[PDB]
Design a protein around this nucleic acid. Structure first.
Ligand SMILES: [K+]
Ligand SMILES: [K+]
Ligand SMILES: [K+]
Ligand SMILES: [K+]
Ligand SMILES: [K+]
Ligand SMILES: [K+]
Ligand SMILES: [K+]
Ligand SMILES: [Mg+2]
Ligand SMILES: [Mg+2]
Ligand SMILES: [Mg+2]
Ligand SMILES: [Mg+2]
Ligand SMILES: [Mg+2]
Ligand SMILES: [Mg+2]
Ligand SMILES: [Mg+2]
Ligand SMILES: [Mg+2]
Ligand SMILES: [Mg+2]
Ligand SMILES: [Mg+2]
Ligand SMILES: [Mg+2]
Ligand SMILES: [Mg+2]
Ligand SMILES: [Mg+2]
Ligand SMILES: [Mg+2]
Ligand SMILES: [Mg+2]
Ligand SMILES: [Mg+2]
Ligand SMILES: [Mg+2]
Ligand SMILES: [Mg+2]
Ligand SMILES: [Mg+2]
Ligand SMILES: [Mg+2]
Ligand SMILES: [Mg+2]
Ligand SMILES: [Mg+2]
Ligand SMILES: [Mg+2]
Lengths: 142, 54, 127, 175, 73
RNA sequence: AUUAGGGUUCGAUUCCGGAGAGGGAGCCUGAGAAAUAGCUACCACUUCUACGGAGGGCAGCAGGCGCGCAAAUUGCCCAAUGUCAAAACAAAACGAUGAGGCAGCGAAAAGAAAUAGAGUUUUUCAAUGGGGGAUAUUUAAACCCAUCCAAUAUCGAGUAACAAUUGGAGGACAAGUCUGGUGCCAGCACCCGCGGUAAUUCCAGCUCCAAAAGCGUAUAUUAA
């Protein structure tokens, strides 16, 4: 009542499944170059950039806070993004024109938490891990 | 207003680490836990029950 | 514990006579129950010569000894040549260098290659 | 490049990390047999699953199938030779009933303790690692050595240990 | 095969029909292939007849077979 | 790779087949080449020069520079495995070989395994490696492994400072209604949600939990 069943009907079944797979959002995103062209990392897991300025982003309701973020320009393709500086007081380790390493935020391009439109995170500055500076296991060079 | 970054971290009174003798490592540590939970001292079981207070 | 002296016992296996190279080849196994360390290979040479009644201990060659884990044993390989002349003819140069009589080392291969490439630019008496 | 030496894996982690019942059952075994880490238990799990998977395949085939005859006798022979099953058990259906403690009993660490050469299962572990135990005149320092039934009666102190004719704290005390 | 066309001079097109099996769906497809065959004047095949052909050396850009026997209708 | 079964996905990379030597054509020799550590020309780059002229091709092995999130030594040797060839090895008398092999660097990944043990009323016993060495062994020569600390004759654990880490403790999900600080701030939080003066969630101290010489994070992909 819903499927063809004939013994010699393999061509119908093959074309049926091929057509309906484009309706799966996950499958389509994997077999189309539109997502990669709009992805600033270009398919990589990390990227390097230069800090342009420090900015503050307000949290979404019902939370209330100022989230410390940074605007960086990527070296490989000269694109501008906004990245989050995670831990407490870690904004003081970052200065303008510093070189930073950026990673994703864990949801494959989706925004995370109460931070509006932020999907990137700072993990390393001036060739030393940011979390290591927070724990004072290393000192900022220069 | 980015001037308040690190407010609580720098405001916390500093408490030093307390020196204590070391714990056994490896197979000895597993032996220690086995005797604490079973064997010694034979309902709900509490692993980190705390003293009362308010 | 009973303090004793040091004594070794030797056995052979997979014996074969090789007339094409004027020698006999076999596997040598030595048991040293109370030895302090590893038995030097020259000592095994003397015992093997005595056991197989060879006129000169210099015509037996031994190499490649592995000590069994746990101690008390060692296994290797041995060759008994028919005479001293045959040994000096059929033996690899590195093995006879261990026994005393061998050619010296030729100069470093890098130096030879440099001279060879320089001479490729010339012709006649210059080369 | 151009190296053809093979290697593989022997253990797998459980797929529910924090299960209260499983955690307690495993802490029982670590204390009872004196193991070092959970990885030693999970190693035994993989061997049992390989045996049980093979048995299920053979029991599907008809009895007179040639592969069932050759493989069935081979796996039963291995179980008897290592003491996993007693010789009364002859049919291939009894291998499906093997459990984790059945294999842990045959470790060298627990064999020497039950043989009387050690005061405790933790005393047995250090003795093996310190080159005091020999199996058929061969020093063994691997606690996970699985002893065969025909080799049980050959376990004794090594001949180079102080405990049996060795000594070729006392050595440093007298100087 | 079966004769498909007889419009060239001393050359015919034959067609072979067969069923191809798709493992995933456990079912079959219909497919066909075409070949160009040299036809000797000793035969007079018509569209729809069945022929037996044999392999030979290359005779043109596309011809690799010769007609050996004709079974009428 | 993943796994009830059916499937989904990866395969530049050791073996087999194809193609190329900056780009693009053309060709001589030769049994065999449209050859590039062969030749000829053009294009793009580029080196020496007494200015007349003459040279170059690392997607071979080491090395540089750039590029990037991203990948080792300008090492030793033909001892083994092979190739070439006028050639067995030796004797005045040692063929070449960055193919290949051996070491250095190397927490990609895989296997084994220390950081104590036994007692007596908080002190007593043994045992052993990490390490230092050796008549020596291994090796082309070294190195690692293995053997030993007298065979007449050979160093060494008590805070055994020879001192284990990485993440967590409302729920999913194993584990504190502890004690200070902060007061919708600073911050946490993959999701639900905490924080506005008594915070089970932030910053710390104690205690506890999980895996353990390993453990977090990001991005892909398989199961779910
Ligand atoms: K013709
Ligand atoms: K190179
Ligand atoms: K060679
Ligand atoms: K190497
Ligand atoms: K390892
Ligand atoms: K010692
Ligand atoms: K509090
Ligand atoms: Mg391939
Ligand atoms: Mg490519
Ligand atoms: Mg190839
Ligand atoms: Mg070519
Ligand atoms: Mg190039
Ligand atoms: Mg020729
Ligand atoms: Mg060419
Ligand atoms: Mg070249
Ligand atoms: Mg001039
Ligand atoms: Mg060129
Ligand atoms: Mg790397
Ligand atoms: Mg010669
Ligand atoms: Mg090389
Ligand atoms: Mg090479
Ligand atoms: Mg340590
Ligand atoms: Mg040592
Ligand atoms: Mg080696
Ligand atoms: Mg806390
Ligand atoms: Mg719980
Ligand atoms: Mg996550
Ligand atoms: Mg308070
Ligand atoms: Mg939580
Ligand atoms: Mg899937």
């Amino acid at each position: 009542m819903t499927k063809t069943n004939g013994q010699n009907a393999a061509r119908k079944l093959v074309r049926l499944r091929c057509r309906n797979r484009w309706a799966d959002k996950g499958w389509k995103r994997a077999h189309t170059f539109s997502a990669r062209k709009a992805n600033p990392f270009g398919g990589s897991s990390h990227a390097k950039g230069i800090v342009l300025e420090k900015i503050g982003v307000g949290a979404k309701q019902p939370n209330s806070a100022i989230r410390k973020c940074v605007r960086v320009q990527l070296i490989k393709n000269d694109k501008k993004i906004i990245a989050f500086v995670p831990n407490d007081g870690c904004l003081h380790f970052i200065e303008e024109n510093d070189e930073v390493l950026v990673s994703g935020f864990g949801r494959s391009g989706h925004a995370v938490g109460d931070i509006p439109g932020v999907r990137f995170k700072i993990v390393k500055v001036s060739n030393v891990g940011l979390y290591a500076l927070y724990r004072q296991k290393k000192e900022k060079p220069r | 207003s980015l001037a308040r970054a690190g407010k609580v971290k720098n405001q916390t009174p500093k408490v030093a680490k307390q020196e204590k003798p070391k714990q056994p490592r490896g197979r000895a540590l597993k032996r220690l836990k086995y005797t604490r939970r079973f064997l010694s001292k034979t309902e709900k079981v509490h692993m980190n029950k705390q003293p009362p207070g308010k | 514990f009973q303090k004793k002296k040091a004594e070794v016992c030797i056995r052979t296996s997979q014996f074969k006579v090789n007339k094409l190279l004027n020698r006999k080849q076999f596997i040598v196994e030595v048991n040293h129950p109370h030895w302090c360390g590893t038995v030097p290979t020259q000592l095994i040479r003397k015992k093997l010569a005595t056991l197989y009644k060879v006129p000169d201990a210099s015509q037996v060659s031994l190499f490649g000894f592995k000590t069994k884990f746990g101690g008390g044993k060692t296994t290797g390989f041995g060759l008994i040549y028919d005479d001293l002349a045959s040994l000096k003819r059929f033996e690899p140069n590195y093995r006879k260098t261990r026994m005393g009589f061998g050619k010296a080392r030729l100069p470093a291969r890098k130096s030879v290659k440099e001279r060879r490439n320089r001479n490729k630019k010339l012709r006649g008496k210059a080369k | 490049m151009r190296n053809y030496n093979n290697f593989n894996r022997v253990w797998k982690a459980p797929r529910r990390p924090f299960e209260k019942e499983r955690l307690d059952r495993e802490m029982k075994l670590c204390g009872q047999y004196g193991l070092r880490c959970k990885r030693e238990i999970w190693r035994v799990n993989m061997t049992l699953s390989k045996m049980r998977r093979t048995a299920r395949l053979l029991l599907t085939l008809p009895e007179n199938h040639p592969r069932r005859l050759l493989e069935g006798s081979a796996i039963m022979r291995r179980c008897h030779e290592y003491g996993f099953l007693d010789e009364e058990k002859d049919k291939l259906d009894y291998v499906l009933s093997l459990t984790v403690p059945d294999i842990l009993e045959r470790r060298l660490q627990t064999i020497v303790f039950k043989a009387g050469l050690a005061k405790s299962v933790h005393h047995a572990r250090v003795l093996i690692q310190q080159r005091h135990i020999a199996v058929a005149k061969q020093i063994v320092t691997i606690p996970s050595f699985i002893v065969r039934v025909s080799s049980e009666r050959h376990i004794a102190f090594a001949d180079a240990s102080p405990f049996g004719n060795g000594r070729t704290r006392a050595k440093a005390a007298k100087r | 095969g079966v004769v498909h066309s007889t419009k060239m001079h001393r050359t015919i097109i034959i067609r072979r029909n067969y069923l191809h099996f798709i493992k995933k769906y456990q079912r079959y497809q219909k497919r066909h292939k075409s070949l160009a065959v040299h036809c000797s004047p000793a035969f007079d095949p018509k569209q729809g007849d069945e022929v037996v052909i044999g392999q030979c050396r290359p005779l043109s850009k596309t011809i690799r077979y010769n007609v050996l026997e004709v079974v009428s209708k």
